[PDB]
Amino acid sequence: GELEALAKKLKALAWKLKALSKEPSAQELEALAQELEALAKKLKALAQG
Amino acid sequence: GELEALAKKLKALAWKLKALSKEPSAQELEALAQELEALAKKLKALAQG
């Protein structure tokens, strides 16, 4: 369900980070970092719900 | 480098979440949520560094 969709976004983000590791800079990294934090907040809400 | 190692942990976490979506419960989910937050904090530090 919604967790299946979130696992997809997390697999997409791991791929962003694999690419980022060959083309790094602060902006993109702190960008992906905040993407993970948003997904973690959604997961937390599903845990509470 | 260290970013290559982190991309590996993120691909591992996406796999945890894919499995979790068929066997969910609050503990494990809030567990994985805090795992993402720790990885995001490491990424942020690399961005700053």
Residue numbers in the entry:
A (entry chain A), B (entry chain A): 1 to 49
Authors' own words:
Starting from a rationally designed homodimer, we construct a library of helical hairpins and identify complementary pairs using bimolecular fluorescence complementation in E. coli. We characterize some of the pairs using biophysics and X-ray crystallography to confirm heterodimeric 4-helix bundles. Finally, we demonstrate the function of an exemplar pair in regulating transcription in both E. coli and mammalian cells.
As a starting scaffold, we aimed to design a helical hairpin that homodimerized to form a 4HB. This was achieved by adapting the sequence of a previously rationally designed antiparallel homotetramer, apCC-Tet,36 and linking two helices to make a hairpin using a loop taken from a natural structure in the RSCB Protein Data Bank (PDB). The resulting peptide was called CC-HP1.0. CC-HP1.0 was soluble in aqueous buffer, and circular dichroism (CD) spectroscopy showed that it formed a stable helical assembly without an accessible thermal unfolding transition. However, surprisingly, the hairpins were in an anti-arrangement rather than syn. Nonetheless, the backbone of the computationally designed syn model and the experimental structure of the CC-HP1.0 dimer are similar: they both have wide and narrow helical interfaces;36 moreover, the positions of the hydrophobic-core residues overlay very well.
